Amino acid sequence: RGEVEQMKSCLRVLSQPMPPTAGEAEQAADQQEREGALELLADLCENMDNAADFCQLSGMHLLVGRYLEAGAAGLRWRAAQLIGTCSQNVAAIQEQVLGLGALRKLLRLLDRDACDTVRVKALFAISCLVREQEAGLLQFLRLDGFSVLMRAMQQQVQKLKVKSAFLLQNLLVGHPEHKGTLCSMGMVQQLVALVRTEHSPFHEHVLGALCSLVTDFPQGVRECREPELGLEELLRHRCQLLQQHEEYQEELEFCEKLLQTCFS
Amino acid sequence: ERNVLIFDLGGGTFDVSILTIDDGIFEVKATAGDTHLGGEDFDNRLVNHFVEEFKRKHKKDISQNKRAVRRLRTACERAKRTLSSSTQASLEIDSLFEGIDFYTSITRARFEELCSDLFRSTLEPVEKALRDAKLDKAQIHDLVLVGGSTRIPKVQKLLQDFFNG
Numbered sequence: 550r551g552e553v554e555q556m557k558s559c560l561r562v563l564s565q566p567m568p569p570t571a572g573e574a575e576q577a578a579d580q581q582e583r584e585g586a587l588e589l590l591a592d593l594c595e596n597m598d599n600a601a602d603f604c605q606l607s608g609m610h611l612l613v614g615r616y617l618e619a620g621a622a623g624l625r626w627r628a629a630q631l632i633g634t635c636s637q638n639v640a641a642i643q644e645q646v647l648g649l650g651a652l653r654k655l656l657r658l659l660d661r662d663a664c665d666t667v668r669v670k671a672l673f674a675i676s677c678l679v680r681e682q683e684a685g686l687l688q689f690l691r692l693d694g695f696s697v698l699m700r701a702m703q704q705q706v707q708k709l710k711v712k713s714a715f716l717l718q719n720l721l722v723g724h725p726e727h728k729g730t731l732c733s734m735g736m737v738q739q740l741v742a743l744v745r746t747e748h749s750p751f752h753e754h755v756l757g758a759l760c761s762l763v764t765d766f767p768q769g770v771r772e773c774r775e776p777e778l779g780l781e782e783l784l785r786h787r788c789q790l791l792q793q794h795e796e797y798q799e800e801l802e803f804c805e806k807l808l809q810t811c812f813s
Numbered sequence: 814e815r816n817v818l819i820f821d822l823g824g825g826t827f828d829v830s831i832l833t834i835d836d837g838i839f840e841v842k843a844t845a846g847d848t849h850l851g852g853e854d855f856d857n858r859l860v861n862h863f864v865e866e867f868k869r870k871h872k873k874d875i876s877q878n879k880r881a882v883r884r885l886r887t888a889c890e891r892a893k894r895t896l897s898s899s900t901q902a903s904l905e906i907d908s909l910f911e912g913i914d915f916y917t918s919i920t921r922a923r924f925e926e927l928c929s930d931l932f933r934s935t936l937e938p939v940e941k942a943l944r945d946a947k948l949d950k951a952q953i954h955d956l957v958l959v960g961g962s963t964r965i966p967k968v969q970k971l972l973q974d975f976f977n978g
């Protein structure tokens with residue numbers, strides 16, 4: 550398609566090494582030209598095929614090694630974004646990105662980048678790599694993933710909070726074996742911390758995870774009965790706020806299933 | 814005398830063909846199919862389910878923004894595939910409409926419910942090629958699947974159940 554030619558066109562643009570210590574209007578220009586080529590690659594890569602062809606063209610290599618580690622935050626998050634877009638729910642592209650050891654660069658970025666946007670697109674990339682992707686979930690746990698995660702929930706960055714809750718809910722569904730290592734890590738307390746925040750959509754995911762940690766798992770049910778948390782008073786006051794609302798149905802199913810197995 | 818059934822489910826069309834191979838001669842003996850059945854079709858069943866789901870949770874209809882509907886569909890195709898190994902998948906689509914970040918899940922089971930009819934209509938062509946080949950399912954010695962969308966568990970199960978094993 551003209552897509553292959555067009556992305557190979559972006560690739561061309563992304564390959565040209567950085568200018569010879571050029572001037573202002575030569576840096577902020579050379580950059581915008583890459584921000585652009587990287588965005589265009591994202592839109593093209595939303596489609597499995599394109600992203601596939603992107604990998605064939607050694608594209609994923611130039612992305613993980615060189616750009617993720619760029620100097621400009623702008624080039625960084627757009628690269629994370631692209632890395633995410635290509636991999637999302639596609640085993641083969643996940644495996645290759647995984648193999649180039651991105652998760653480690655991604656996790657690093659997530660845990661300590663000066664631009665909240667880079668941290669957010671990184672978490673996005675990470676999620677797109679370990680969800681429903683076994684080999685990626687392992688490289689993740691081995692990289693202390695649940696700790697880079699939780700520290701994110703603790704960040705004063707909404708998108709990080711929602712994105713983190715969203716991924717934990719996923720991970721908990723396909724792998725209930727981790728319930729324990731999570732509770733003992735104090736994730737219940739943390740999750741509950743996010744509930745006490747201003748209600749918004751992502752709460753469905755928070756209560757969603759919380760609900761799994763408690764499912765056939767007394768250690769977790771114990772975590773929720775903890776008096777200090779006051780999780781009960783909290784979930785009943787919420788159970789009542791989500792009533793005639795259809796846009797919060799799944800939260801109410803979760804919020805209730807919780808009460809029903811931790812307070813009777 | 815050997816009857817091989819070729820079941821080809823691609824991204825746009827579904828084609829079945831009963832091929833006999835005897836005496837070292839391969840001969841196509843019958844052909845059937847539906848030109849409005851394919852992977853693309855299954856995708857849109859998921860697209861609709863979410864566009865509707867998105868009306869419920871965000872009080873907004875994304876139907877008329879085709880750039881957004883396309884992203885949704887490309888995302889769905891990715892999920893539909895994941896749903897061939899996993900028993901469920903999740904979708905993360907940043908700024909899908911009016912700057913809203915979209916998050917959702919779907920279970921292999923749910924996927925199937927939404928595609929029930931489409932799934933059962935793939936047999937129609939099989940049965941027809943069987944009549945047109947003046948053969949009975951019981952004679953098909955081999956079943957080979959070709960076409961990305963022949964990996965969908967529910968597809969091979971409907972097929973396999975047809976030939977009672």
Ligand SMILES: Nc1ncnc2c1ncn2[C@@H]1O[C@H](COP(=O)(O)O)[C@@H](O)[C@H]1O
Pocket residue numbers: 822823824851852853890893894897959960961962963964965
């Ligand atoms: N593992 C899979 N499970 C379900 N559908 C798939 C799978 N792999 C590919 N497809 C679909 O098959 C179609 C492409 O078929 P083909 O042109 O024969 O390669 C697309 O709609 C794909 O999304």
